[PDB]
């Protein structure tokens, strides 16, 4: 019950985006253990579906509160709760397309639920690219580098991502993020890693395009002594 978070919370998701001119809105709700960096997100496309681009590109847009932080690493994110935090991210794929996303994370103590406001925009996905051809299956597990920006008291994210393709090829992407606490940080953490594992399961049917995302993230430092 620290900072407004419990070992078993819920979340509500709302995302509005536009990719190469195609507008869309996504409604969702999930649950997870902010302390074990584990969450189950359930999303449904209410507007724009069926999406003309691969839904995998949106995955990383839907919450560092769900990160397991050991005692040795300051937890900037939970530290700024229940107020929440905001982040801004961009990424260019190896084929020129670039996307940017922003989200506002707010914790509602009364409901023991987290409210996620998501924004996503992308441009220039090649017509014959794996994204427009829906040939992606999952983001390969990664190791994100979290750097502290002292002067301004915020964090920077740097992670090389690979979107695995059905044809076995790898689609490289560079995540560059800025994490801002909605509350003046009293203590800034040192640099550290955050390994992630994000999986997508298509739950689509004749009526709706929907899917589930399971994210497992955990912080740490150099494995080397």
Interaction of residue 133 with a second copy, rule CB under 8 A: no
By CB under 8 A, name the one of 2, 8, 96, 183 that touches a second copy: 96
Interaction of residue 92 with a second copy, rule CB under 8 A: yes
Phi and psi for 78 in degrees, rounded to 5?
Answer: -65, -30
Using the structure block, give the residue that is written with the tokens 């924004």.
Answer: 119
Is residue 196 within 8 A of residue 141, CB to CB? The reply is: yes
Interaction of residue 191 with a second copy, rule CB under 8 A: yes
Radius of gyration of the chain (CA): 17
Interaction of residue 132 with a second copy, rule CB under 8 A: no
Interaction of residue 83 with a second copy, rule CB under 8 A: no
d(CA 197, CA 184): 30
Interaction of residue 188 with a second copy, rule CB under 8 A: no
Min CB(45)–a second copy separation in Å: 20
Is residue 102 within 8 A of residue 124, CB to CB? The reply is: no
Min CB(68)–a second copy separation in Å: 10
Interaction of residue 46 with a second copy, rule CB under 8 A: no
Give me 186's structure tokens.
């009293």
Count CB neighbours of 7 within 10 A.
11
Interaction of residue 145 with a second copy, rule CB under 8 A: yes
Interaction of residue 216 with a second copy, rule CB under 8 A: yes
Which residues in the chain are followed by a discontinuity, with C-to-N distance exceeding 2.5 angstroms?
A: 62
Interaction of residue 24 with a second copy, rule CB under 8 A: no
By CB under 8 A, name the one of 18, 46, 51, 113 that touches a second copy: 18
Interaction of residue 201 with a second copy, rule CB under 8 A: no
Q: Smallest Cα–Cα separation from 136: which of 161, 100, 118?
A: 161
Interaction of residue 138 with a second copy, rule CB under 8 A: no
d(CA 166, CA 126): 17
Q: Pick the piece of the chain touching a second copy (CB under 8 A) from 52-60, 72-80, 108-116, 190-198.
A: 190-198
CA dihedral (108, 146, 58, 127) in degrees, to 10, reads: 160
Count CB neighbours of 190 within 10 A.
11
Residues at the interface with a second copy (CB under 8 A): 18, 20-21, 86, 88-90, 92, 96, 98-100, 102, 104, 119, 121-124, 127-128, 140-143, 145, 147, 150-152, 158-160, 162, 168, 170, 172, 176-178, 191, 193, 195-197, 216-218, 220-225
């Amino acid at each position: 019950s620290a900072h407004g978070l419990t070992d078993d919370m819920t979340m509500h998701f709302r995302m509005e985006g536009c990719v190469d001119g195609h507008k869309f809105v996504i409604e969702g709700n999930g649950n997870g253990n902010p302390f074990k960096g584990k969450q189950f997100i359930n999303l449904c496309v209410i507007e724009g579906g069926p999406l003309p681009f691969s839904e995998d590109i949106l995955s990383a847009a839907f919450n560092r509160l769900f990160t397991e932080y050991p005692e040795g690493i300051v937890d900037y994110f939970k530290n700024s709760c229940p107020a929440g935090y905001t982040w801004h991210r961009s990424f260019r794929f190896e084929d020129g397309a670039v996307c940017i996303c922003s989200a506002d994370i707010t914790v509602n103590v009364r409901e023991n639920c987290i409210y996620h406001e998501s924004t996503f925009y992308g441009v220039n996905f090649p017509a014959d690219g794996p994204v427009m051809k829906k040939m992606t299956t999952n983001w390969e597990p990664s190791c994100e580098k979290i750097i502290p920006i002292n002067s301004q008291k915020i964090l920077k994210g740097d992670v090389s991502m690979y979107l695995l393709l059905k044809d076995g090829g790898r689609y490289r992407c560079q995540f560059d993020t800025i994490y801002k606490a909605k509350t003046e940080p009293k203590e800034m953490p040192d640099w550290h890693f955050i390994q992630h594992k994000l999986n997508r399961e298509d739950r689509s049917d004749a009526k709706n395009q929907k899917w589930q995302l399971i994210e497992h993230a955990i912080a740490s430092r150099s494995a080397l002594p």
